[PDB]
Amino acid sequence: MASNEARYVLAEEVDFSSPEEVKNWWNSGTWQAEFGSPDIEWNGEVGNGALQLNVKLPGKSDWEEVRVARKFERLSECEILEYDIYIPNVEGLKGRLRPYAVLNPGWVKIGLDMNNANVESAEIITFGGKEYRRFHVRIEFDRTAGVKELHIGVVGDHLRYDGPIFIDNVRLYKRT
Numbered sequence: 001m002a003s004n005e006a007r008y009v010l011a012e013e014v015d016f017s018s019p020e021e022v023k024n025w026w027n028s029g030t031w032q033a034e035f036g037s038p039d040i041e042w043n044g045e046v047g048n049g050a051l052q053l054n055v056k057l058p059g060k061s062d063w064e065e066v067r068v069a070r071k072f073e074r075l076s077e078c079e080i081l082e083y084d085i086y087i088p089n090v091e092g093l094k095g096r097l098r099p100y101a102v103l104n105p106g107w108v109k110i111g112l113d114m115n116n117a118n119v120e121s122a123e124i125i126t127f128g129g130k131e132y133r134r135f136h137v138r139i140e141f142d143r144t145a146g147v148k149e150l151h152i153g154v155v156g157d158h159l160r161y162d163g164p165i166f167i168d169n170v171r172l173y174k175r176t
């Protein structure tokens with residue numbers, strides 16, 4: 001067996017292709033940041049369907065968090081999470097991102113500071129003639145009994161930004 005054989009298989013995938021999927025997500029919190037109005041909605045132009053978070057990040061502190069969540073029935077079986085964040089590549093965008101996730105019940109914080117990035121060096125991707133900074137997040141965690149929902153924490157670190165941020169391609173994997 002090749003040493004690069006994937007030891008995992010895709011158990012759950014959310015690509016936000018339909019706006020109905022957004023109704024399954026909710027905002028589960030803020031700290032030193034705010035949501036706008038509405039807090040979340042669907043966007044059909046980014047990632048051919050993405051979760052749009054309308055955020056207000058003052059960029060004054062090193063942890064400015066907005067958080068969203070969704071139930072996942074099979075989550076206790078899983079050990080790897082991947083997801084993408086896209087931020088409009090607007091003039092002057094500067095700062096650090098500290099994205100992570102939470103398994104719940106149990107409020108189990110996973111991948112803390114495991115996927116940090118300077119926004120100014122992040123990959124650029126284009127959708128519909130517009131540029132985005134891309135942040136791919138990959139988090140490893142233990143099979144955890146009783147967990148039923150996943151929270152995605154989008155955390156700014158002196159990243160002043162008022163506008164939409166996007167989440168896409170939420171994928172959960174279990175070991176074979």
Ligand SMILES: [Ca+2]
Pocket residue numbers: 015016017046047048049050168169
């Ligand atoms: Ca998508």
